[PDB]
Design a protein around this motif. Structure first.
Motif, short mmCIF file in Angstrom:
data_model
loop_
_atom_site.label_atom_id
_atom_site.label_comp_id
_atom_site.label_asym_id
_atom_site.label_seq_id
_atom_site.Cartn_x
_atom_site.Cartn_y
_atom_site.Cartn_z
N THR A 44 -1.71 10.52 3.05
CA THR A 44 -2.87 10.57 2.15
C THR A 44 -3.31 9.17 1.71
N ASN A 45 -2.34 8.32 1.37
CA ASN A 45 -2.63 6.99 0.82
C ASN A 45 -2.02 5.86 1.64
OD1 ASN A 45 -1.85 8.87 -1.93
ND2 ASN A 45 -3.95 8.08 -1.73
N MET A 46 -2.73 4.74 1.70
CA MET A 46 -2.31 3.58 2.47
C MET A 46 -1.26 2.77 1.72
SD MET A 46 -6.04 2.27 3.67
CE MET A 46 -5.57 0.97 4.78
N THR A 47 -0.28 2.28 2.47
CA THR A 47 0.71 1.35 1.94
C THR A 47 0.04 0.00 1.67
OG1 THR A 47 1.42 0.51 4.11
CG2 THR A 47 2.49 2.52 3.31
N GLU A 48 0.79 -0.93 1.08
CA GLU A 48 0.27 -2.27 0.76
C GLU A 48 -0.30 -3.00 1.97
OE1 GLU A 48 3.49 -3.52 -2.01
OE2 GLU A 48 2.06 -5.05 -2.67
N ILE A 49 0.53 -3.18 3.00
CA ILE A 49 0.12 -3.91 4.20
C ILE A 49 -1.03 -3.21 4.93
CG2 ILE A 49 1.86 -2.97 5.82
CD1 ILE A 49 1.94 -6.22 6.64
N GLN A 50 -1.05 -1.88 4.90
CA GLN A 50 -2.17 -1.13 5.46
C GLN A 50 -3.47 -1.51 4.75
OE1 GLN A 50 -0.97 3.02 5.34
NE2 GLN A 50 0.55 2.72 6.96
N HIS A 51 -3.48 -1.38 3.43
CA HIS A 51 -4.63 -1.78 2.61
C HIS A 51 -5.02 -3.24 2.81
CE1 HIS A 51 -6.98 -2.50 -1.19
NE2 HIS A 51 -7.49 -1.34 -0.81
N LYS A 52 -4.02 -4.12 2.86
CA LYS A 52 -4.24 -5.54 3.06
C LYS A 52 -4.78 -5.86 4.46
CE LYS A 52 -0.87 -7.80 -0.05
NZ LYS A 52 0.16 -8.88 0.01
N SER A 53 -4.33 -5.08 5.44
CA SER A 53 -4.50 -5.43 6.85
C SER A 53 -5.67 -4.76 7.57
CB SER A 53 -3.19 -5.16 7.60
OG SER A 53 -3.41 -4.56 8.87
N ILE A 54 -5.88 -3.47 7.30
CA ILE A 54 -6.79 -2.67 8.13
C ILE A 54 -8.26 -3.12 8.06
CG2 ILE A 54 -7.79 -0.34 8.49
CD1 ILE A 54 -4.93 0.79 8.26
N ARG A 55 -8.84 -3.09 6.87
CA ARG A 55 -10.21 -3.56 6.65
C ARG A 55 -10.51 -4.86 7.41
N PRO A 56 -9.74 -5.93 7.13
CA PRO A 56 -9.93 -7.21 7.83
C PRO A 56 -9.75 -7.13 9.35
CG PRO A 56 -8.68 -7.57 5.84
CD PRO A 56 -8.82 -6.08 5.99
N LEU A 57 -8.80 -6.31 9.81
CA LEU A 57 -8.50 -6.19 11.24
C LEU A 57 -9.60 -5.47 12.00
N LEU A 58 -10.28 -4.55 11.31
CA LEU A 58 -11.44 -3.85 11.86
C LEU A 58 -12.59 -4.81 12.12
CD1 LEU A 58 -11.38 -0.79 9.47
CD2 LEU A 58 -11.04 -0.62 11.95
N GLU A 59 -12.76 -5.77 11.21
CA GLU A 59 -13.78 -6.81 11.35
C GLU A 59 -13.52 -7.69 12.57
OE1 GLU A 59 -13.29 -8.30 7.37
OE2 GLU A 59 -15.16 -7.39 6.66
N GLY A 60 -12.24 -7.88 12.91
CA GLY A 60 -11.85 -8.53 14.16
C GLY A 60 -11.02 -9.80 14.02
N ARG A 61 -10.31 -9.93 12.90
CA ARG A 61 -9.50 -11.12 12.62
C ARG A 61 -8.10 -11.03 13.22
N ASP A 62 -7.50 -12.19 13.51
CA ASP A 62 -6.15 -12.27 14.07
C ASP A 62 -5.11 -12.35 12.96
OD1 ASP A 62 -7.49 -12.38 16.50
OD2 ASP A 62 -6.20 -13.97 17.31
N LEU A 63 -4.26 -11.33 12.83
CA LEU A 63 -3.33 -11.27 11.70
C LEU A 63 -1.92 -11.82 11.99
CD1 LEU A 63 -2.97 -8.62 8.95
CD2 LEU A 63 -1.04 -8.85 10.52
N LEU A 64 -1.42 -12.61 11.04
CA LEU A 64 -0.02 -13.00 11.00
C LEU A 64 0.61 -12.31 9.79
CD1 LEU A 64 1.30 -16.66 11.56
CD2 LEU A 64 2.65 -14.83 10.51
N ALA A 65 1.42 -11.29 10.05
CA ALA A 65 2.03 -10.48 9.00
C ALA A 65 3.54 -10.70 8.87
N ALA A 66 3.98 -10.95 7.64
CA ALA A 66 5.41 -11.02 7.33
C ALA A 66 5.85 -9.64 6.88
CB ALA A 66 5.67 -12.07 6.26
N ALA A 67 6.00 -8.74 7.85
CA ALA A 67 6.25 -7.34 7.55
C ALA A 67 7.61 -6.86 8.01
CB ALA A 67 5.16 -6.47 8.17
N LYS A 68 8.17 -5.92 7.26
CA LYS A 68 9.45 -5.30 7.59
C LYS A 68 9.24 -3.82 7.96
CE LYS A 68 10.00 -6.89 2.82
NZ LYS A 68 9.91 -5.76 1.84
N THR A 69 10.25 -3.22 8.59
CA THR A 69 10.18 -1.81 8.98
C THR A 69 10.26 -0.91 7.74
OG1 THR A 69 11.20 -2.25 11.15
CG2 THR A 69 11.22 0.04 10.38
N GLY A 70 9.21 -0.12 7.53
CA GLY A 70 9.10 0.75 6.35
C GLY A 70 7.84 0.45 5.58
N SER A 71 7.16 -0.62 5.97
CA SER A 71 5.93 -1.06 5.32
C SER A 71 4.72 -0.22 5.72
CB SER A 71 5.67 -2.54 5.63
OG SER A 71 6.78 -3.33 5.26
N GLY A 72 4.85 0.54 6.81
CA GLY A 72 3.72 1.29 7.38
C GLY A 72 2.87 0.41 8.28
#
Ligand SMILES: [Mg+2]
Ligand SMILES: [Mg+2]
Length: 211
Positions: free
Chosen positions: A25-53
């Motif tokens: 139902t709801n987006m995790t932190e990295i999802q919220h942080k990442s998706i919008r910008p990634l749809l626009e077409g930016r190259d992401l460098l994420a410091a993410a761990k397993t469980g972040s979504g």
């Protein structure tokens, strides 16, 4: 509003409908942080761990580019997801399978030491989104002739630090080199390492960093 339904314009309804049937139902932190910008077409460098979504974070915009550009088996490959292990490659693939239930585009797991010829015949058909493991993928890219990657739009590197630890530092450098440079590239790593920052230079152009 970190909900999934407010991502309708930006992401195809068939994608949200699947994700709603996944039970989310709801987006995790990295999802919220990442998706919008990634749809626009930016190259992401994420410091993410397993469980972040993080899986959905990269998959939503990956499937979006394939649907938006209306890919076909004809078009070769569009997205390329790299995974260190078979456990994670399979993991990510099961999610992809769920997310693609209302789509016609072709997806496959071209990873691990498992029946090389059957994968080759499969890739020859045209597989749009590919969840793969580095060492075997490079083997297809150098030896399987009917494998088309020239149209690639998105490249995702999951657990970057874990990929280097299993001894794929050279296998990486060589796939990236052989990939079309006009592309969106995503790098996910739990641990910020000296080596990690180096292949980030190779893979990315001018990234929005997310921690
Ligand atoms: Mg090796
Ligand atoms: Mg990670």
């Amino acid at each position: 509003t970190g909900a999934f339904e407010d991502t309708s314009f930006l992401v195809n309804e068939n994608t949200l409908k699947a994700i709603k049937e996944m039970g989310f139902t709801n987006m995790t932190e990295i999802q919220h942080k990442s998706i919008r910008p990634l749809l626009e077409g930016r190259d992401l460098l994420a410091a993410a761990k397993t469980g972040s979504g993080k899986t959905l974070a990269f998959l939503i915009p990956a499937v979006e580019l394939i649907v938006k550009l209306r890919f076909m088996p004809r078009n070769g490959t569009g997205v390329l997801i790299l995974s260190p292990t078979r456990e994670l490659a399979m993991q990510t693939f099961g999610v992809l399978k769920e997310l693609m239930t209302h789509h016609v585009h072709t997806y496959g797991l071209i990873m691990g030491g498992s029946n090389r010829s059957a994968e080759a015949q499969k890739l020859g058909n045209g597989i749009n989104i590919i969840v793969a493991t580095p060492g075997r993928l490079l083997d297809h890219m150098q030896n399987t002739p009917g494998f088309m990657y020239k149209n690639l739009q998105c490249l995702v590197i999951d657990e970057a630090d874990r990929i280097l630890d299993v001894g794929f530092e050279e296998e990486l450098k060589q796939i990236i080199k052989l990939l079309p440079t006009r592309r969106q590239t995503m790098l996910f790593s739990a641990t910020q390492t000296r080596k990690v920052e180096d292949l980030a230079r190779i893979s990315l152009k001018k990234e929005p960093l997310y921690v």
